[PDB]
Design a binder for these strands. Structure first.
Ligand SMILES: CN(C)C(=O)CCc1cnc2c(c1)c(N)c(C(=O)NCc1ccc(F)cc1F)c(=O)n2O
Ligand SMILES: CN(C)C(=O)CCc1cnc2c(c1)c(N)c(C(=O)NCc1ccc(F)cc1F)c(=O)n2O
Ligand SMILES: [Mg+2]
Ligand SMILES: [Mg+2]
Ligand SMILES: [Mg+2]
Ligand SMILES: [Zn+2]
Ligand SMILES: [Zn+2]
Ligand SMILES: [Zn+2]
Ligand SMILES: [Zn+2]
Lengths: 296, 258, 278, 278, 258, 296
DNA sequence: GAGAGAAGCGCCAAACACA
DNA sequence: ACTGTGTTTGGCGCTTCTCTC
DNA sequence: GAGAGAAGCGCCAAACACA
DNA sequence: ACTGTGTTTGGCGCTTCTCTC
């Protein structure tokens, strides 16, 4: 076709839309290692010029672009997950995937982005389909997904309580129904980022969220792979309010495994940080039960 | 080229894959070389581990002071010919310069790390210090990489070898779990906090009056928005078709036209 | 006649105007006088700026400075990134190509591998050993115009900054070891001090996400050449020389034939505009 | 704590602010640090200006410069009027008090008798013979701060101007005699060239009607003194010294005790403000 | 004091009257000293008269080249030890520097003033030259003043004596007809022409933004009218009670407020 | 009294008027060498502060000052002339005279001077009384008078033809009626300054002025004392128009004295300059009579 | 009760030195 | 290709706050 | 005929060097 | 009392003028 930068601005938006649409065609690397080589090369090139162009001009993004880009992302990303296979394998379509993630990230944080236009082109269905994608096995996939979900949650206002309820639901499903998940650490990072910005006083919904899904997450046999991040999140609650720490320590002590295991040290480590914050405010109410449980 | 890169650094195949090499020829080069064929900290610069190691040579010994981050695995190593509290202080300061200030420090008992000098040095930086009696793996990677480098060429001054080994470990090799290098994991900025009941607005940058370099002009033509800001220059669109990096001396602070 | 009066006395513009001449004729007489232009040190040409990288680890500037401490002359090898401003510095006992190579390797370990490095024409930088080392890691090394330190200005500035902190560190405690002082100063410069204009830290710029790609550049230059009076950078001269005609004009300098045999690259700040002889 | 952090690293304002401190506390910490003020060459004080006459033949400035011509080193004695800018210059073979007296007499014949003359501390100006000559005609002679040529700046500037014309006169004809060149240059400077800002000639100002009398002056000066870091004009120093307290402050300089025995006059441009110890 | 002035310069009593001395004590000092007891040009620097004179000494001779203006009597004298066209050229140039460029020049025939060197020198300056065969009085005043100076002190280098004599003749002695010195008559500006049917309006000077010296200010406070303009400074009223000479570097050109 | 600079500006003008009025008192030095020493000293002082103050402040001169200053000048200068006595004698009242001349000169050329205010306070009587004063014998008196009359003629417009007629009348009186005058050279300078600014074509009145009073002025036995200046004036006419030079040369040749006298060289000198301008424009109409007259 | 001094804070051109 | 730059510092305009008639 | 290029002219900040 | 200054130079805003549709 024709490069977007070498056209008069009068019809430049139309060429941008056309170049958006020409990348909507799919290309399957998993089907066969060699298929449509020049088509794939021109798609990669076009993605490169698009990501270059979007981040060097202002007042380029207007209303007839917002839904089409969302459609492009949905066509390129939202799909059936690869079959579960339990170093992790790498997705063979990584070039196009990485380039389109770069483009989407640069598009979401442009200064010309308007929050009054995406409320009708991005809805709960899109964010649910995005959150479903965290179960991928490629770590880079999960990294880009985390840094995209952070911006999505930060930018929008009417999609905060919905996402909190959905994350509670997915935590319930992971801890009770389905035991197959690998995006837990990135989700814990998102939770830590969200909870670092709470205000006082804490509403009872956050107390329920603590008392229901976060402490019992310690019971997972695969705790170690996401051990540090989890602890971080806990540390970010008892700092906001030192009064509400009694249920946390009570749950940690009562549900502490009475049997010897190499992972017990994990808990000990966490306890240390808790102790490092619990000494002030005269917190000796549960000191004796804590010592009694630690003695065994 | 990948062949020269591996011949000079002897990094893993997954390191070569990040360069122009593809997985199959990466494995080919990996097996074509004769010499090659839990996290306790919560955030980077939270808990460090400090060891003193003996590097053996044919006719001499070296003492490597090594500091390893418990979260990213980033390594800071310094070689000396003795072992004392002063050299422990120097190694800690060098590691702080390369990596940053740690909040908590952990090491073993010994002639160093226990005298009043090291304690005073830690208190000057306000670093909490705990010592215990029994990582040792990164030490092994450092030893084997140094040995490969010296086997390739016996005429090395032991400082270039250490620098190249540190570069290979921190910037070239990639971690298996997350497909990242130690440098990226250590220095990746964290996600900003998200306030509740308050939208996170996008930060608005500044406006500048500018002059085009190499014209000897004396009139500031037009206030423009800055795209990117760096040391020594800022990115300004001189026209609607191209952008240029204008130095600070040719830029003047403006106000939004409103 | 204004022309003969100026040829005798070399009086100024207003003197010729008061004896009868238009402003245009008097100004033309002034501009056409070789004596009044070879002997006036004043001149008016654009300023030059060092080339800057478009992303971290693109272009680096390196230099060697001296430091006096406890009757010891330490040599400080300093490398600075032209994009982020990040600084790596190592202290040694003397200056040598091998020590320059060692400092380059330490800087690469501390910051990363650069694409290009530009340094002055020091004895340890034009050596064959340094070129071989740069080619080994595929690093393109260029050199500045000789006897023109302003072309390395950024790194020169950094040298001063570094030394200033060291002096402070030696004002409080003269018994502080050199390595400790250098490490603390590097930590302060790269992690604690905030850059004046971008209001950020050098480390923050160095490791900020590389999401913005490189804008495309154009090697298009002006196809016309002019006449110039010139001064040789190596030796200071009281009066201008020439004028000659530039073989080719670059951004910030020009190629001027000093003699009938070979030419030389002269920065814009040692040049003066000349009227066309024809 | 910001105080201990700055005492260890001597970081800047923003570094202390990001570790928790108000702008006022951080700025006070910066201003109270002796190390950060003895080692920073930057400073901010008002400029000084030479004393100027209120009418022609009130204050003169004189100096001796050198000129190289046909393997001969001529000494040019130059006198300039600080009101009109009129210049008298004589060429001699060496420098001596007697030749300074002769040049002064020739300048008096050419221009008139001045009231005061101020020159640097040259060997031929502090001599007893020159003082006797000045007292003979009732001319008050003062001297500048030693090793501070800027205090004679006007005459210094004139020297350069004069020499420039001579070079032009020797560019066209290298066989022109020195006396002819000097006479023609003096004629051009005093009668033909027009001053830049007042748009008049030096001769016109010198002989313009003295109808405007002298405005009255006031010797009132500030009665308060301050503390200052200082640098001795004679020898350049990398770092400031002191601080000490000024015995008395004049317009453009101050009296500073360098040692416990005697004081010295220091211009404003080698001084730096200091915080009061109490 | 008048006594010292006469003892050093030996000028006339009417010269002393311009100083603090009154006529009676002026005459007293005049008679108390042992050693003391038509115009052809139309304007200054119109016609000059050039002579070469022999000054006699006890063991040497001097040759004084003297140029006298026919309108004001101003004298430019230069002493040499020889007589040639080159020294005539040098003396003429020195007289031009001291007095100004003459339009018409007149002198006697001789080895000088008649060679091609002097003719070429006159044509370079565009000076019309006429020579004739027969002022000699000013030469006599110069001789007698020099003789008095040498009689007062025999240890003089003949340059200081000439300079003091020229100062006394041009700046100290006053003419009898008009009670003026030669310097004032020579350098008195002439009356400007008066156009007909056009009023001669008063020239309006300029307005300046100024800064007070010795304050390190950075804001130009108020545009004011300049009283007097000189080299290096201008007279500006800082307040409604006093005026000050502000240097040019602290002045900035302004526009009338209207 | 009180210094003018040390008072609030509200009543500063009143103090200026009072200090003007206090100097109106006369002081006669010719009556006796010593009379009212302290009165004379305070008058001299006050004149000094007045001349200092007038030239350092703006917007200080207003309507109630203009006529009073003219009255002060008239009281201090306009008086009966000293008796004729044919080096010239010096006026004994020179201090006050010189100071008041300095003050008047500085006042006449102040930028705040307005030409619409002095047309009703200065009239023909004042200028006639001023012109009558040129007959003084002190040369400095005549110098200040010349430089004052130049400004007076330049500033005013309705007093130009009147002064030309008056100067013609005084020239007629000097050449025919009264032979006692000594201000001729200063008047010739004023005439030269006035005639350097003529425009073309020259009106017939200027031709009459040339043909009536200027050439016959050559007949005065005291010509030498004002010889150069006169010549200058002649040179300034024949430059404006080279056609009207025939009557001038005819009068110079016909009235050339046929008898030998040392002053004849004077005429010769003048002739030279005339010749130096008469060679162009083919002026040989009177060359033969000129040569015939010069031969004798 | 309320407007006038006082404290706080971000910004800027001129100096400065890097052999 | 060839090319000067970054930090320090008192003085101000600005905003917000406290003690007094 | 008429508004668009061209010539004329006064002004200014940054460079410069005075051992 | 003690103290930096005056000239040169291309680039502009300004005003006035000439050749072309
Ligand atoms: C060419 N040949 C054969 C050689 O031997 C070259 C020797 C060599 C190597 N390096 C050098 C220098 C000399 C050198 N004189 C300076 C230097 O003058 N600095 C002061 C400085 C002044 C002005 C400025 F604007 C900035 C400044 F920094 C310097 O900085 N560096 O790096
Ligand atoms: C005190 N004792 C014992 C002595 O021997 C004194 C010897 C002596 C006498 N006169 C001198 C000098 C030295 C001298 N170094 C200069 C001089 O540096 N000029 C360059 C200059 C630089 C900067 C500036 F801003 C302006 C300038 F002009 C000078 O001009 N003059 O007159
Ligand atoms: Mg350098
Ligand atoms: Mg000197
Ligand atoms: Mg000097
Ligand atoms: Zn290998
Ligand atoms: Zn010239
Ligand atoms: Zn400090
Ligand atoms: Zn005598």
């Amino acid at each position: 076709l024709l490069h977007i930068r070498d056209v008069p601005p009068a019809d430049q938006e139309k060429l941008f839309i056309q170049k958006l649409r020409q990348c909507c065609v799919l290309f399957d690397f998993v089907s066969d290692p060699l298929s449509d080589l020049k088509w794939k090369e021109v798609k990669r090139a076009a993605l490169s010029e698009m990501v270059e162009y979007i981040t060097h001009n202002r007042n380029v993004i207007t209303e007839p672009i917002y839904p089409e880009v969302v459609h492009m992302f949905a066509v390129n990303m939202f799909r059936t997950l690869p079959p579960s296979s339990n170093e992790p394998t790498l997705e063979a379509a990584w070039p196009h995937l990485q380039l389109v993630y770069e483009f989407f990230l640069r598009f979401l944080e442009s200064p010309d982005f308007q929050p009054n236009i995406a409320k009708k082109y991005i809805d709960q269905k899109f964010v649910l389909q995005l959150l479903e994608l965290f179960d991928s096995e490629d770590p880079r996939e999960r990294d880009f997904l985390k840094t995209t979900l952070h911006r999505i949650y930060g930018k929008f206002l009417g999609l905060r309580a919905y996402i909190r309820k959905q994350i509670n639901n997915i935590f319930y499903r992971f801890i009770y129904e389905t035991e197959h998940h690998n995006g837990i650490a990135e989700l814990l990072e998102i939770l830590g980022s969200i909870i670092n910005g709470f205000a006082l006083p804490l509403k009872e919904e956050h107390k329920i969220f603590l008392l229901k899904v976060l402490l019992p997450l310690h019971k997972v046999k695969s705790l170690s792979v996401y051990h540090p991040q989890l602890a971080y999140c806990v540390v970010q609650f008892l700092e906001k309010d030192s009064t509400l720490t009694e249920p946390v320590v009570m749950a940690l002590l009562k549900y502490w495994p009475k049997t010897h295991s190499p992972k017990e040290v994990m808990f000990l480590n966490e306890l240390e940080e808790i102790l490092d914050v619990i000494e002030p405010s005269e917190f000796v109410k549960i000191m004796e039960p804590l010592f009694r449980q630690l003695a065994k | 080229s990948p062949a020269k890169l591996h011949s000079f650094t002897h990094c893993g195949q997954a390191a070569l894959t990040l360069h122009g090499a593809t997985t199959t020829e990466a494995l080919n080069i990996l097996h074509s070389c004769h010499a090659c064929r839990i996290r306790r900290g919560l955030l980077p610069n939270h808990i460090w581990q400090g060891d003193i190691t003996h590097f053996k040579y044919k006719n001499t010994l070296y003492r490597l002071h090594v500091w390893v981050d418990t979260f990213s695995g980033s390594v800071s190593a310094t070689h000396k010919k003795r072992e004392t509290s002063s050299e422990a202080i120097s190694s800690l300061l060098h590691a702080i310069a390369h990596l940053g200030r740690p909040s908590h420090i952990n090491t073993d008992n010994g002639p160093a790390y226990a005298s009043q000098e090291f304690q005073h040095a830690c208190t000057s930086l306000a670093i909490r210090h705990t010592t215990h009696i029994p990582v040792e793996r990164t030490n092994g990677i450092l030893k084997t990489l140094l040995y490969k480098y010296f086997s390739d060429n016996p005429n090395l001054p032991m400082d270039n070898a250490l620098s190249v080994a540190l570069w290979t470990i921190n910037h070239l090799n990639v971690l298996t779990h997350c497909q990242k290098t130690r440098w990226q994991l250590h220095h990746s900025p964290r996600l900003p906090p998200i306030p509740e009941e308050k939208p996170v607005t996008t930060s608005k940058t500044h406006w500048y009056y500018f002059k085009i370099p190499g014209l000897n002009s004396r009139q500031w033509k037009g206030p423009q928005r800055a795209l990117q800001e760096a040391a020594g220059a800022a990115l300004i669109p001189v026209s609607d078709t191209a952008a240029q990096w204008i130095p600070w001396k040719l830029l003047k602070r403006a106000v939004c036209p409103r």
